[PDB]
Amino acid sequence: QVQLQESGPGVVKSSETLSLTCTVSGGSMGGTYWSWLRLSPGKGLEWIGYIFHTGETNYSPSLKGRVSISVDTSEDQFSLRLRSVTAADTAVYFCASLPRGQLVNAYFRNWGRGSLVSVTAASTKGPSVFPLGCLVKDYFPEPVTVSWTFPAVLQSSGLYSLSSVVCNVNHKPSNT
Amino acid sequence: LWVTVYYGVPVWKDAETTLFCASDNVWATHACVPTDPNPQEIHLENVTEEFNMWKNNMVEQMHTDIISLWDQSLKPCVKLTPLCVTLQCTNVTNNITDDMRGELKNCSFNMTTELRDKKQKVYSLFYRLDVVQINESNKEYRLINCNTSACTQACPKVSFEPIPIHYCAPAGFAILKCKDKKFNGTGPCPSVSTVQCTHGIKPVVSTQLLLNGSLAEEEVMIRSENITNNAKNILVQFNTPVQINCTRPNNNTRKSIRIGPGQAFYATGDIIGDIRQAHCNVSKATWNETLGKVVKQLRKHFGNNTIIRFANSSGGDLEVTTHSFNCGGEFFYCNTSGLFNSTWISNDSITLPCRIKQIINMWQRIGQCMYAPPIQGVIRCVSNITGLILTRDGGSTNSTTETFRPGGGDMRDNWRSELYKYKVVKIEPLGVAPTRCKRR
Amino acid sequence: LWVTVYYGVPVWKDAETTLFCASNVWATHACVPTDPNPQEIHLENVTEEFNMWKNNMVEQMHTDIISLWDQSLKPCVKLTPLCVTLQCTNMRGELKNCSFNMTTELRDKKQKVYSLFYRLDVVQINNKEYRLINCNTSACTQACPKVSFEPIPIHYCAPAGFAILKCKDKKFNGTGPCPSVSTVQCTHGIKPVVSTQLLLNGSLAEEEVMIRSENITNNAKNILVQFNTPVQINCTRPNNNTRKSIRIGPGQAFYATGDIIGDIRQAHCNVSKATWNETLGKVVKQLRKHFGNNTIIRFANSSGGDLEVTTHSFNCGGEFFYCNTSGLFNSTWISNSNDSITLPCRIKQIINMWQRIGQCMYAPPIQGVIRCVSNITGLILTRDGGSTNSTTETFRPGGGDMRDNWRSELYKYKVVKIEPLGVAPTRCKRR
Amino acid sequence: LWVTVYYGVPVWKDAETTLFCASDNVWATHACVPTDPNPQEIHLENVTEEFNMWKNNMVEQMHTDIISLWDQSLKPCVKLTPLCVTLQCTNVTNNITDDMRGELKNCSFNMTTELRDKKQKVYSLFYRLDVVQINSNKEYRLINCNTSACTQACPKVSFEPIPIHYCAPAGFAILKCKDKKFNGTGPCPSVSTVQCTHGIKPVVSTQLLLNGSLAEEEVMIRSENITNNAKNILVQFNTPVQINCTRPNNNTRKSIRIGPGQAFYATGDIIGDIRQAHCNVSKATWNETLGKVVKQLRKHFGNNTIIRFANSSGGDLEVTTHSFNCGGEFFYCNTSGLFNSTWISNTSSNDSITLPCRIKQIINMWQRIGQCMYAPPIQGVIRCVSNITGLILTRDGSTTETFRPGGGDMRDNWRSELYKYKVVKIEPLGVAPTRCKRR
Amino acid sequence: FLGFLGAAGSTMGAASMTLTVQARNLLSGQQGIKQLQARVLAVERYLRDQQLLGIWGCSGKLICCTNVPWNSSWSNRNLSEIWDNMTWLQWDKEISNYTQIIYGLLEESQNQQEKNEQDLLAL
Amino acid sequence: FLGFLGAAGSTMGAASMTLTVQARNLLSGKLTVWGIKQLQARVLAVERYLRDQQLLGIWGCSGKLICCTNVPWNSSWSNRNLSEIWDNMTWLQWDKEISNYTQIIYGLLEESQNQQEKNEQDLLAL
Amino acid sequence: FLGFLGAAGSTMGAASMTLTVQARNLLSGIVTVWGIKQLQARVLAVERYLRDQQLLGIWGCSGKLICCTNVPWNSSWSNRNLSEIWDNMTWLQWDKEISNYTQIIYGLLEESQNQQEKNEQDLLAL
Amino acid sequence: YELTQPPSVSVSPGQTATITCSGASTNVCWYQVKPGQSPEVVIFENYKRPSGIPDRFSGSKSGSTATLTIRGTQAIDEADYYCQVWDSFSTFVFGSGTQVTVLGQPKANPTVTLFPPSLVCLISDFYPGAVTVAWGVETTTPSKQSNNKYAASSYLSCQVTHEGSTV
Numbered sequence A: 001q002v003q004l005q006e007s008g009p010g011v012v013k014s015s016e017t018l019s020l021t022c023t024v025s026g027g028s029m030g031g032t033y034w035s036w037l038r039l040s041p042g043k044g045l046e047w048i049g050y051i052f053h054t055g056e057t058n059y060s061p062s063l064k065g066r067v068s069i070s071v072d073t074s075e076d077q078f079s080l081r082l083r084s085v086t087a088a089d090t091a092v093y094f095c096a097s098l099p100r101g102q103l104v105n106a107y108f109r110n111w112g113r114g115s116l117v118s119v120t121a122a123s124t125k126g127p128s129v130f131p132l133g134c135l136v137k138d139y140f141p142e143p144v145t146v147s148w149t150f151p152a153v154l155q156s157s158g159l160y161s162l163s164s165v166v167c168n169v170n171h172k173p174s175n176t
Numbered sequence B: 001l002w003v004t005v006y007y008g009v010p011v012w013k014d015a016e017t018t019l020f021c022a023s024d025n026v027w028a029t030h031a032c033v034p035t036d037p038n039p040q041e042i043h044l045e046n047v048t049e050e051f052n053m054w055k056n057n058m059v060e061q062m063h064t065d066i067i068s069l070w071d072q073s074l075k076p077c078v079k080l081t082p083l084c085v086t087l088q089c090t091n092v093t094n095n096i097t098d099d100m101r102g103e104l105k106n107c108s109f110n111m112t113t114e115l116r117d118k119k120q121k122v123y124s125l126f127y128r129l130d131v132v133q134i135n136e137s138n139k140e141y142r143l144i145n146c147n148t149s150a151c152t153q154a155c156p157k158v159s160f161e162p163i164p165i166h167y168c169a170p171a172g173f174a175i176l177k178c179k180d181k182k183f184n185g186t187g188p189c190p191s192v193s194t195v196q197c198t199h200g201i202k203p204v205v206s207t208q209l210l211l212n213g214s215l216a217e218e219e220v221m222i223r224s225e226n227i228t229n230n231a232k233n234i235l236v237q238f239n240t241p242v243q244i245n246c247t248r249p250n251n252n253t254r255k256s257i258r259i260g261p262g263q264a265f266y267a268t269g270d271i272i273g274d275i276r277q278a279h280c281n282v283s284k285a286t287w288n289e290t291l292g293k294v295v296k297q298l299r300k301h302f303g304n305n306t307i308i309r310f311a312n313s314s315g316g317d318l319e320v321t322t323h324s325f326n327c328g329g330e331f332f333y334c335n336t337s338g339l340f341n342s343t344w345i346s347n348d349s350i351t352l353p354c355r356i357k358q359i360i361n362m363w364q365r366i367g368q369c370m371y372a373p374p375i376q377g378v379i380r381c382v383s384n385i386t387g388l389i390l391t392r393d394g395g396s397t398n399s400t401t402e403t404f405r406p407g408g409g410d411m412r413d414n415w416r417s418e419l420y421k422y423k424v425v426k427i428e429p430l431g432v433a434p435t436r437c438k439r440r
Numbered sequence C: 001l002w003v004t005v006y007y008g009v010p011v012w013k014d015a016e017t018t019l020f021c022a023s024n025v026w027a028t029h030a031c032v033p034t035d036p037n038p039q040e041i042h043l044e045n046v047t048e049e050f051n052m053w054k055n056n057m058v059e060q061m062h063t064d065i066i067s068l069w070d071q072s073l074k075p076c077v078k079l080t081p082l083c084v085t086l087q088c089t090n091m092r093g094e095l096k097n098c099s100f101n102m103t104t105e106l107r108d109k110k111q112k113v114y115s116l117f118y119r120l121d122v123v124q125i126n127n128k129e130y131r132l133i134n135c136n137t138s139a140c141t142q143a144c145p146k147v148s149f150e151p152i153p154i155h156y157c158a159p160a161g162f163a164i165l166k167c168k169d170k171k172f173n174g175t176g177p178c179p180s181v182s183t184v185q186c187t188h189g190i191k192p193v194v195s196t197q198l199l200l201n202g203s204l205a206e207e208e209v210m211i212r213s214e215n216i217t218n219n220a221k222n223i224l225v226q227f228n229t230p231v232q233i234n235c236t237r238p239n240n241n242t243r244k245s246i247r248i249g250p251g252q253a254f255y256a257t258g259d260i261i262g263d264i265r266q267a268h269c270n271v272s273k274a275t276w277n278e279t280l281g282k283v284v285k286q287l288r289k290h291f292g293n294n295t296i297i298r299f300a301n302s303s304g305g306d307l308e309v310t311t312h313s314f315n316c317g318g319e320f321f322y323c324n325t326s327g328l329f330n331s332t333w334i335s336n337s338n339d340s341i342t343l344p345c346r347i348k349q350i351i352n353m354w355q356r357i358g359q360c361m362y363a364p365p366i367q368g369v370i371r372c373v374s375n376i377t378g379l380i381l382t383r384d385g386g387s388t389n390s391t392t393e394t395f396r397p398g399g400g401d402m403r404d405n406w407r408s409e410l411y412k413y414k415v416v417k418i419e420p421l422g423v424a425p426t427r428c429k430r431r
Numbered sequence D: 001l002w003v004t005v006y007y008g009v010p011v012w013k014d015a016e017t018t019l020f021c022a023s024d025n026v027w028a029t030h031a032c033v034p035t036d037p038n039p040q041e042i043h044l045e046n047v048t049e050e051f052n053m054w055k056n057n058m059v060e061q062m063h064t065d066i067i068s069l070w071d072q073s074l075k076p077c078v079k080l081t082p083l084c085v086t087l088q089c090t091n092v093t094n095n096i097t098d099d100m101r102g103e104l105k106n107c108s109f110n111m112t113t114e115l116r117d118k119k120q121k122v123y124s125l126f127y128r129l130d131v132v133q134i135n136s137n138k139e140y141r142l143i144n145c146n147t148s149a150c151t152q153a154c155p156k157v158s159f160e161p162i163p164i165h166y167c168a169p170a171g172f173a174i175l176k177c178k179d180k181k182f183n184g185t186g187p188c189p190s191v192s193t194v195q196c197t198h199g200i201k202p203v204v205s206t207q208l209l210l211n212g213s214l215a216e217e218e219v220m221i222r223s224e225n226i227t228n229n230a231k232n233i234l235v236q237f238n239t240p241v242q243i244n245c246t247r248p249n250n251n252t253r254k255s256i257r258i259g260p261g262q263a264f265y266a267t268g269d270i271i272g273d274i275r276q277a278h279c280n281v282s283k284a285t286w287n288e289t290l291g292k293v294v295k296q297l298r299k300h301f302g303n304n305t306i307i308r309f310a311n312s313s314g315g316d317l318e319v320t321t322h323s324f325n326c327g328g329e330f331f332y333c334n335t336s337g338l339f340n341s342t343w344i345s346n347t348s349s350n351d352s353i354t355l356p357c358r359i360k361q362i363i364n365m366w367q368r369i370g371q372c373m374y375a376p377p378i379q380g381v382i383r384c385v386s387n388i389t390g391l392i393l394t395r396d397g398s399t400t401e402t403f404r405p406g407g408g409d410m411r412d413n414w415r416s417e418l419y420k421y422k423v424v425k426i427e428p429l430g431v432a433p434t435r436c437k438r439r
Numbered sequence E: 001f002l003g004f005l006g007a008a009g010s011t012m013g014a015a016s017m018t019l020t021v022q023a024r025n026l027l028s029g030q031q032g033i034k035q036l037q038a039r040v041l042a043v044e045r046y047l048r049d050q051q052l053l054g055i056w057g058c059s060g061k062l063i064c065c066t067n068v069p070w071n072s073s074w075s076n077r078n079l080s081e082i083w084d085n086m087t088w089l090q091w092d093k094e095i096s097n098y099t100q101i102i103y104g105l106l107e108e109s110q111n112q113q114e115k116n117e118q119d120l121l122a123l
Numbered sequence F: 001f002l003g004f005l006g007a008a009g010s011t012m013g014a015a016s017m018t019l020t021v022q023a024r025n026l027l028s029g030k031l032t033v034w035g036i037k038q039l040q041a042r043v044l045a046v047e048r049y050l051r052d053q054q055l056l057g058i059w060g061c062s063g064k065l066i067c068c069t070n071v072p073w074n075s076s077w078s079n080r081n082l083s084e085i086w087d088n089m090t091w092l093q094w095d096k097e098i099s100n101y102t103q104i105i106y107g108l109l110e111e112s113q114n115q116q117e118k119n120e121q122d123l124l125a126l
Numbered sequence G: 001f002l003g004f005l006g007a008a009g010s011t012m013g014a015a016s017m018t019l020t021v022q023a024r025n026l027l028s029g030i031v032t033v034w035g036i037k038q039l040q041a042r043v044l045a046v047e048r049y050l051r052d053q054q055l056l057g058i059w060g061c062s063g064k065l066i067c068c069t070n071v072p073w074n075s076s077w078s079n080r081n082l083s084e085i086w087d088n089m090t091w092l093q094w095d096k097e098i099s100n101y102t103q104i105i106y107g108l109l110e111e112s113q114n115q116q117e118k119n120e121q122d123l124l125a126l
Numbered sequence H: 001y002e003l004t005q006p007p008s009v010s011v012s013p014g015q016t017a018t019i020t021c022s023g024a025s026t027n028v029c030w031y032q033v034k035p036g037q038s039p040e041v042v043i044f045e046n047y048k049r050p051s052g053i054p055d056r057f058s059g060s061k062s063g064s065t066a067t068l069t070i071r072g073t074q075a076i077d078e079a080d081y082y083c084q085v086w087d088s089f090s091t092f093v094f095g096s097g098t099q100v101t102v103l104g105q106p107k108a109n110p111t112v113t114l115f116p117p118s119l120v121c122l123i124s125d126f127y128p129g130a131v132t133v134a135w136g137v138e139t140t141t142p143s144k145q146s147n148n149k150y151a152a153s154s155y156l157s158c159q160v161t162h163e164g165s166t167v
């Protein structure tokens, strides 16, 4: 009967602080390790850390020194804080729970929905349309609609590109 | 044949009731019934009674009794609500031995005075496990649970030393004692003896090693609810005791800080001499012999060829993965990974490092804690290890290796090793029987 | 003739004793046994003189409801640090926006935080400087947001040696002999409800609308009316409220009001006109029996001064409404399809429930929109006389004392003790 | 001869139980069982009982009940936590204050109010006995700001003692000794049996007894051991001696708010003149009562023994000085002119003796550490009349014997009324033999 | 079967055949301090009636006979009219007074009976 | 002297001679946690004694430990006769055999006692 | 009328008709901190009265104030005359000189009642 | 350490698929990850199985390798499978990830188009489920398009290497 849901899917820039709050509905906060996990296409599934109701945390050694988990028992919440986020932390963040006791055979239960968090890496630019089909070179906010289509490309500079084969281009923020 | 009515027949049925206690402190033995020394135990000769130590209500009644008896001794004690302030903590580097490095923090903070319009700047030595940084030469700190609850300091005039208590039975009820020396917890007993009240149960709190308490008679006994299932704990009872020796080598000082009218907070002053970590000792040969006897007894259930292994704990919190007790009023946490590390193919000492907390959260209640006051001088401790709580890791229906790790967590399994030979019944004195006799 | 002593005779006398109570709420599962399939032994040829205006169970119900009201407030936060100097800004002029200093978990630091209070909860201490209405009388304790004030029934069982007699007369007016006395183990499910001028969620009369009073000639006594058909009522609180948690100190939180999403409109809830008309017709038809066939029955809105007496105070969904009932008690009656009547309501957060001096409650806000659905099952009238031969009678709603809401449910019940010892002459003597 | 079993025989044995109060304030007599007027008092003709009052248990139960009712009545009262502030007092010299009146300081301090972000500067008049220094004007504080926090008693609750009756439960009985000359230990003939005791008033006093039952025919003196020097020697009077203590200062009570729904009643200005509270005791009646005491003292201690009286030796203020309360003010009358008499053995009206009576506001009642009671001031002029019906002596030690008034140990004050009562447990089962046999 | 009080309106000749079902429903039950005080009061109320039955010598039986004669001043009615044209409620309403004198006469009669029995057994 | 409940292993022929040691051992034979619950235990013990004494008093066997009635023993309740019941079985094994049929016996005994009391009153009438 | 407990000074002969005026008052004589005190006093009084009634009912004297028993008198607990026991002695010194040998009587009465019940059971079987 | 898993396992419908892990010293439990849904456990020990999981999932472990076998897979088992293991230093150590693909469609030949600058390489209409483009190179992961095919793109400021048939 215990269900978990986190905050809405936000988006952050580089060198900032990430913040997600999970809310438990039903059940108590005692005798349960409230964990945090993330899932990325580059590295697969990964564990971040858990907090017990007395405040005893246990972070992952890879992310130690830039992670912080706090518990708020009275309002039935627990939060995750990530410090100095880079462009390689674009992942779907889950929340789970573990029974108190031995962790040799323990598996994560009561998973969350999963809120996608992306990192912009400080990029904002208007469209650039080149003729060939048609090719769009650089645009940040994904507003494009090609009318007279291959999906976008995660370039290393933080900008997106697609192309279409067989025109009019659209850009909602720049009004292009 | 006619119906004949008899009153007072020896017929009992299983039932439950509220058992009152007796005694020969937190446990508050001044208000209990005194115990009269009398030949209270007699023998029932040709009877067999079904026992079950895993479905006994007395281990669920006595847990609630200890919980309700524990928190009423905190009501005439000071609550540390004004202490949740900002702490300016500093590392101590006064004759450390490179093991207790960074464990103690020298924190100075503002505190109220008995006069309401004055303030004082005091200082204390807090452990690392009781302080949490907030600004993620001096850094700002705070207590570990002032975001959760402000909790009562334990008064210095009461003691946490356990004393034996007896559990009597009310009128119309009886307590039957299991006198079989080869009892395994569940099953019928061919030697059942009634008794007026139980023996002395000492309410010693522990998590991995059953300190003090009663021993076995013939040999080491293994008790479980279901030995095939790996999700249920295994209680081991020894026949000979293994002696442990506590130590806190630091010479602490306690100073009183007045935080209000008639209320005092006991802080930690400076430490005379060097700072050394706490440790516990155990003999190597006696522990090796006891582990050999436990391995010999464990091969009766899991095959007579399997390689019994041991490994250290795998818990998450500090009360499960680390052996915890109290001695002299200070709560210890023993690493105990040097004991359970061996494999068994078919005057040296082991030193176990320790850690000490002060913000104590007993009985796993939400939003309640305790501040343990410091103890002046060194602290000594002699105890008997008369039991273990093991947990098995099983991922094969047929296997040649088994790994046993120490358990813990739930406090209820400590008193199930003392109330396994007792049960409560209700006497029903009415009965009818046919006999060739009739009224007028 | 010789005296023969009989034991266990069915003889009873009236008495007063402590009754039982069987059934996160008003009452509690902590203080109740279970109540299986009951017994309704129908006592034949019995005539017992009931009286509902001097019953003992209504006072016991009032005492138990008050005492178990108080028992859910002890493990809750007391809002004593919140009596500060508010700096408030601005239907219109009803919802204010106050900001104030407030302490934090750490005693050294302090925070500035804002909240929305109503106009009935703040008072000016001489403009742009307000304080709460309770802070010169008593500090309020908050209601913890797990316990709910939703009505569920409770049953009053009887102890050993005592019996509860239920009158089964269809046309029983409250006092007099009842020729259908039947005992019962425990009383039926009585729902405790807070209400004024309109008995909500109550039991209905089975044959006709009944008029009950202690003295219908005297005008100083309340008149209890019971219906046979219910009148529905549906509410709205169209403000999309947001609850935010201001943290007071260690483990103590104060649930305030955030911003209001959308437009701001007042609270109101409706009575269908085609039912309330001819419901008042049945009421006038049954009131003309006690006052003559040629009397002009008329109604007025209110005459009190306090807010709880004047307005219909109840609890819809967790919020305490104070609805101004003047469109319902507006009629005249002379002897010879989807429209509704809207009543403007008000919301108060600082609540003094049982008219006690020095004990109050801050009620937390509720997220979303809150709706009623209820049955109006009774009225509390108060006649204003003046003339011995009056062709026009004015009836006004009343209230005040709380025991009259539970006197419409414990009206058919009476508790008696058993006296099982009797003597009688019989032609037999002991050898 | 065969054994015959009797049920209901009149046989009693010594035991102890929990008696319950009954009556027809601090002591909640309205929570007692409402008793009727006493219907019967059964007289027992040929009954001889061995009484003892220094091992009586009803004294301890009465002491526990009085302490428990005091603690219960001070529970829902306001607690004066924020009164422990730094007082800035100035010594008062406004017009005629006598040379014996260099006390009653005038203190001003900052105090909190209903809204917790504002402060108010108020003033109050405190006595010298409740204010100590901490070091134009000096800086002071209250006396118990390092021991406890005081709980101010409400003005609607009075300290006037009304009588309570102790009644034995079912299966027990109370034996009353009706001897005219009874010294407290030994066989008392003419034992009477009652179900409830008489109208015992829980009066609080130190060296005298102020509202009690008079003796039967003579001034009777009683003690646990006459030859022991460390035992109090209780004296009960035959004739009552009237004492008048009054407070001539006209007082005004203010109201200072200290928070949400809390009040602190402080002494305002004095409307009139400052004069000492005095304690009048008539001289000729006291001389006659001292003669009646010393006659029985010469009877008990030696018929040529020289008996000397003196004032108290030393200790706390609550021990060496007669302490009581009329209304709500706690007087402390000196009582040094009362015992200043030599009584040689060879020789064998409107005028009265005045005693200076000091007043404390902060009262430590039952000499318990951590408890306090701030008595609020009472406006007007306090007047009271009462009877000195007994006093507690203490022998200090040849032919010369010095007697000092005792103090403390309120169970000795409650031994002056529970000296004739005794609780027994009935055992109705007999095995006396007859000349009958069963079928 | 009638019930717990199913003979409350029946005649005294018919309600005397069902005295068991009211007698056994007098201790615990078709019938913190609030529970305990009521239970102690019920136990005491049963024990008072048992003691009053035991002093008169009528202990252990629901219907008993004694040797106390019936005074005509208490009631002057017929035997076929009291037991056939009356209920127990109107009978208790009739003799509400003169009950204490009947109890005292029963106690005196039982004491004299026990003295005579002891005198006869002494031989 | 075996003691309290010391004859439970013996046969019911010899365990019926020691009914006194189990009859006598009944009936006792918040400021503190130990206050309310021991009072509730005492009240429960008193009520459990009084219910059994009332059940003995309704059947007409008040004040005696062994009482003889006049209700015939049905063969449907049991088929064993006197020889092996009182010499081979104990009370615990006999309690588990007639556990289903005790309410019928409890009704028949009170019906027979009511009939006997009404017959006694009718005989005393003449 | 001597009232309650008014015959304690009278001899054994005069005090033997006033058992009923004392036996009425062993159970009740009456119509916050005073709640639990009165509760435990009522519980203790009820339990003491029930213990006395059970002790009377064990010996076979239930419902009677005076009863005879078949056990004889050894004339060693008290060897004095019958004329000077019931006419020249009160109950208090009788208890004071019998209290040593009051324990062996209380088992003899029970054993005599048990033997009488067994003999009655054997006699009614014919 | 780190557990090792095969990157891709492809089976026909009705057949069985075996996923193996390695380098694990204690008990291994498996997770099933579908796109757009929360992960769920299917085998919570070496051999056990929770309620609500069908009989088609079973597993075993011998030595230090744990194998998970799917018995008669359908199209609803197209997911990504991860296994974890417990370690003393880092508390949970997960696997690399094995993707199970069922073949409801026959093989298809990709179409490659190239454009000169006024560089892009566009690959479409293929079903092996995987294309590794070899020539500042950015490669698009294979995503779906209409009529149940896949698409890919490449950018340079091209050779498809389409298994054994390089275009």
Ligand SMILES: *[C@@H]1O[C@H](CO)[C@@H](O)[C@H](O)[C@H]1NC(C)=O
Pocket: D091, D092, D093, D102
């Ligand atoms: C008040 O008393 C003190 C006691 O030392 C004295 O010095 C001072 O002069 C007095 N004050 C006045 C104003 O006379």
